[PDB]
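Input record (Table S2, row 87):
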Amino acid sequence: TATHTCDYAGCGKTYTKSSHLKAHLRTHTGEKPYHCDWDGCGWKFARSDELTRHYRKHTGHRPFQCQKCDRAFSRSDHLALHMKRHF
DNA sequence: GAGGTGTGGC
DNA sequence: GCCACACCTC
Ligand SMILES: [Zn+2]
Ligand SMILES: [Zn+2]
Ligand SMILES: [Zn+2]
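Output record (zinc ion complex):
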């Protein structure tokens, strides 16, 4: 039940929220509103969370620490898969 | 691990 | 719109 349809070149992809469609439309337009501000870096991204992932390459930030060993991860889904190895 | 992206509470 | 969740593919 998706009411927000993409009307670009007969794409037809449909989403549940308008903000989802607006983000998808960037695949057709090449718009990248989220700019890395790291010194000397000119990378830009269509989604804010893609920029977050990029910043963690600059900072080495790994917020998701495994509570059963010393390993840490930049993303929760990486940790979740690793945790299965403990059980 | 990384890239891409569909989803939904707020 | 922000943000992280969740899943697929490589
Ligand atoms: Zn489209
Ligand atoms: Zn950067
Ligand atoms: Zn572990």
